[PDB]
């Protein structure tokens, strides 16, 4: 069923080479080679986690016969009110060790051992502000002691949390900011979704002035709304049998925002 195949495809996800992802990877290679700790910040739909998964899925783990894996980059995501044990538990599991019951110092000692054993160069912590205030002592320690670039990813609240501890603030001072699309850059990006992501049977001409007004007012420049609006409009218009997106059907999806 050709319709149902497109509804099963379009509700999926992709990664697109965009300037704001290519920029991050050139920057994170700089921090990894230089071993310098830093932070990535910006508004919640700019696509920072996709840009970091595109980094983790490049730089693949290397396998040597019967050795533990050599893992250049670690990406973890903490749970809410993450304590020192929960950070160490996750780093240990990500490098493929099972964590056995122990005191906080057993988890600390085993984590330091597996980070130094797996040859880790960079540790990326998503949603860094889920960390409890004391755990940053253990993150500073990992970065002081081992040759590891810690990268904190968050939004503008993360800075409101980092600024409550002088020891973290003066270490995680170097930063890159993820920004919103505009002008020619929003215009050019809409064409990339039409031709690389949506795969509709005839051109929808989404970059035209009568259509960019609709899409501009809907998306505000957020890449996370652009992908959401254009998948929802494609799913909906195919279930009505059109080979395109058009003015009225896109205004139906945008009127939900």
């Amino acid at each position: 069923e050709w319709l149902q195949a497109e509804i099963a495809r379009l509700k999926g996800k992709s990664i697109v080479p965009l300037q704001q992802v290519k920029t991050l990877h050139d920057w994170l290679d700089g921090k990894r080679k230089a071993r310098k700790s830093c932070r990535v910040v910006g508004e919640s739909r700019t696509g920072k986690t996709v840009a970091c998964d595109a980094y983790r899925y490049r730089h693949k783990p290397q396998q040597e016969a019967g050795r533990p894996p050599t893992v250049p980059v670690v990406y973890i995501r903490p749970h809410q009110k993450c304590g020192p044990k929960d950070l160490f538990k996750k780093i240990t599991e990500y490098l493929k060790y099972r964590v056995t019951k122990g005191t906080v110092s057993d988890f600390r000692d085993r984590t330091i051992e597996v980070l130094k054993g797996c040859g880790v160069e960079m540790l990326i912590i998503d949603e860094a502000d889920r960390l409890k205030p004391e755990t940053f002592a253990d993150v500073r320690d990992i970065a002081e002691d081992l040759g590891i670039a810690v990268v904190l990813v968050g939004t503008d609240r993360l800075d409101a949390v980092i600024k409550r501890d002088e020891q973290v603030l003066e270490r995680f001072r170097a930063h890159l900011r993820f920004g919103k699309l505009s002008g020619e850059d929003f215009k050019n990006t809409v064409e990339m979704w039409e031709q690389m992501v949506l795969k509709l049977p005839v051109s929808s001409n989404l970059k035209s002035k009568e259509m960019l007004r609709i899409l501009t007012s809907a998306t505000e420049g957020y890449i996370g709304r652009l992908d959401e609006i254009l998948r929802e409009a494609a799913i909906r218009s195919l279930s009505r049998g059109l080979k395109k997106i058009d003015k009225a059907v896109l205004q139906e999806v945008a009127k939900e925002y």
């Binding site: 999926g12 992709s14 990664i15 998964d53 595109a54 693949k60 783990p61 396998q63």
Partner: peptide
Amino acid sequence: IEVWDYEQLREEYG
């Protein structure tokens, strides 16, 4: 220019 399926990236990973 190349675009990636987020599940193909998962399948290709270590």
